Design an enzyme around this catalytic site. Structure first.
Site, PDB file in Angstrom:
ATOM      1  N   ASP A   1      -8.844 -22.587  90.682  1.00  0.00           N
ATOM      2  CA  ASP A   1      -7.625 -23.328  89.049  1.00  0.00           C
ATOM      3  C   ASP A   1      -8.938 -22.543  88.275  1.00  0.00           C
ATOM      4  O   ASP A   1     -10.059 -23.307  88.468  1.00  0.00           O
ATOM      5  CB  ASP A   1      -7.347 -24.158  88.867  1.00  0.00           C
ATOM      6  CG  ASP A   1      -7.136 -24.954  88.081  1.00  0.00           C
ATOM      7  OD1 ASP A   1      -7.502 -23.700  86.376  1.00  0.00           O
ATOM      8  OD2 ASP A   1      -7.207 -26.251  87.549  1.00  0.00           O
TER       9      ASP A   1
ATOM     10  N   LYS B   1     -13.864 -19.035  79.238  1.00  0.00           N
ATOM     11  CA  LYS B   1     -12.564 -19.004  79.127  1.00  0.00           C
ATOM     12  C   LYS B   1     -11.981 -18.621  77.535  1.00  0.00           C
ATOM     13  O   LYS B   1     -11.743 -17.878  77.803  1.00  0.00           O
ATOM     14  CB  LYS B   1     -12.231 -19.567  79.938  1.00  0.00           C
ATOM     15  CG  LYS B   1     -10.645 -19.868  79.502  1.00  0.00           C
ATOM     16  CD  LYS B   1     -10.167 -20.373  80.961  1.00  0.00           C
ATOM     17  CE  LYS B   1      -8.523 -20.306  81.136  1.00  0.00           C
ATOM     18  NZ  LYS B   1      -8.068 -21.846  82.123  1.00  0.00           N
TER      19      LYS B   1
ATOM     20  N   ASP C   1       0.837 -30.008  80.108  1.00  0.00           N
ATOM     21  CA  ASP C   1      -0.747 -30.128  80.299  1.00  0.00           C
ATOM     22  C   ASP C   1      -1.053 -30.427  79.175  1.00  0.00           C
ATOM     23  O   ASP C   1      -2.016 -29.802  78.567  1.00  0.00           O
ATOM     24  CB  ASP C   1      -0.600 -27.948  81.064  1.00  0.00           C
ATOM     25  CG  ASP C   1      -1.886 -27.980  81.193  1.00  0.00           C
ATOM     26  OD1 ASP C   1      -3.260 -28.623  81.462  1.00  0.00           O
ATOM     27  OD2 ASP C   1      -2.629 -26.214  81.412  1.00  0.00           O
TER      28      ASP C   1
HETATM   29 MG   LIG Z   1      -6.461 -26.359  83.750  1.00  0.00          MG
END
Ligand SMILES: [Mg+2]
Ligand SMILES: Nc1ncnc2c1nc(Br)n2[C@@H]1O[C@H](CO)[C@@H](O)[C@H]1O
Length: 390
Positions: free
Chosen positions: A12, A73, A201
């Site tokens: 991840d 990211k 999330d």
């Molecule tokens: Mg995450």
């Protein structure tokens, strides 16, 4: 005849933290790093003598802000002109430069000014996750599944694969983070018939809701919604402002201009916030916080819940929007899955459970580990090479 094959890993690759797992002996092992942490900060720091990655980079960030890179990211596969990039740059202490309308991070490293593409910084985080896995397995690792957000476009997905190739990994597949969390619970192994799954999330800096449909193990992304300005760091900020005010009332001193005192306060607040997820109150004990004054205080879970009440309630707006976009009613959702450390907050769980009329939430797999867990399950499936019997 045929040598035993090395295990493949599931990574991840997160915005703030990354996690690695391996499926062996019919189960997933989430692999702790050499400081005993099951998640590793997605940070890379540069000095005159070293390049530090993970906990070592995050632990020296206070005195080296210009040469410690995080949030790569948010830049990966994006153009320098992209409005998301331009806004994000105002919050970062490190330099982001323009190289042919492609962003690069520019730092001081080993006596020189060096610029890196976001995929190069992500490859350094991936190299650390590969080394964490090899320290546990006791042999070199080659194969990996890497996850990405469901909203990532083709350019963002290709740059993630490029980061894997730079790190010396063979990228088996790029899979969506909500799909990986669903796979972690075996939600693609329930047989024939359609299932609607909602993934909730809540990260350090952003909030994402995804609705997936699963039919005979086939996944379809039905809707994505979220809030780019909602995460764990906003709850830390509310505690910071509360304790700055409390110090003002009690000692008649404004601490907000001593960066060290504010940083020590924020670090203490984040830990108190974590304690409040398991306890109904938490102590705050800082020695010589400002002008040699010891700051020894407490906060109840009820007061913390009141401080962040509007932020917690706002997580339900993208849920209702995702349900409208998917053209579904809340009763039609079969499974609710929690992702992100911020989902351990009891009040966040209560609001969502209440919204879905008392339904159980899947939270048995640590929410900060569920994505790597599913990525590890998939990695073991992808390397199978069984030849059929007669
Ligand atoms: Mg995450
Ligand atoms: N038990 C927990 N209760 C409340 N919050 C938590 C917990 N564990 C984690 Br991890 N967090 C927060 O999750 C985010 C991950 O980037 C950060 O904001 C962490 O503070």
């Amino acid at each position: 005849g045929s040598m035993a094959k090395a295990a493949a890993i599931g990574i991840d690759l997160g915005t703030t933290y990354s996690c690695v797992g391996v499926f062996q002996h019919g189960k997933v092992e989430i692999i702790a790093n050499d400081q005993g942490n099951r998640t590793t900060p997605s940070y890379v720091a540069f000095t005159d003598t070293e390049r530090l990655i993970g906990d070592a980079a995050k632990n020296q960030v206070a005195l080296n802000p210009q040469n410690t890179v995080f949030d790569a990211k948010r830049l990966i596969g994006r153009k320098f002109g992209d409005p998301v990039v331009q806004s994000d740059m105002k919050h970062w202490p490190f330099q982001v430069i323009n190289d042919g309308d492609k962003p690069k991070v520019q730092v001081s490293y080993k006596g020189e000014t060096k610029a890196f593409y976001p995929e190069e910084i992500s490859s350094m985080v991936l190299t650390k996750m590969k080394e964490i896995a090899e320290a546990y397995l006791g042999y070199p690792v080659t194969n990996a599944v890497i996850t990405v957000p469901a909203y990532f476009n083709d350019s963002q997905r290709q740059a993630t694969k490029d980061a894997g190739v730079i790190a010396g990994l063979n990228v088996l597949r790029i899979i969506n983070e909500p799909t990986a969390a669903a796979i972690a619970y075996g939600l693609d192994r329930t047989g024939k018939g359609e299932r609607n799954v909602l993934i909730f999330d809540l990260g350090g800096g952003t909030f994402d809701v995804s609705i997936l449909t699963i039919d005979d193990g086939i996944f379809e992304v039905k809707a994505t919604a979220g809030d780019t300005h909602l995460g764990g760091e906003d709850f830390d900020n509310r505690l910071v402002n509360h304790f700055v005010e409390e110090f003002k009332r009690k000692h008649k001193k404004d601490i907000s201009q001593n960066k060290r005192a504010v940083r020590r306060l924020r670090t203490a607040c984040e830990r108190a916030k974590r304690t409040l997820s398991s306890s109904t109150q938490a102590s705050l004990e800082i020695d010589s916080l400002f002008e040699g004054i010891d700051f020894y205080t407490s906060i109840t879970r009820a007061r913390f819940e009141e401080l962040c009440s509007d932020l917690f309630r706002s997580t339900l707006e993208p849920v209702e929007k995702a349900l409208r976009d998917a053209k579904l009613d809340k009763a039609q959702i079969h499974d609710l899955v929690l992702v992100g450390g911020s989902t351990r907050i009891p009040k966040v769980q209560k609001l969502l459970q209440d919204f879905f009329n008392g339904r159980d939430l899947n939270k048995s797999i640590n929410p900060d580990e569920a994505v790597a867990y599913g990525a590890a399950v998939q990695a073991a499936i992808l390397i199978k090479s069984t030849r059929a019997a007669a």
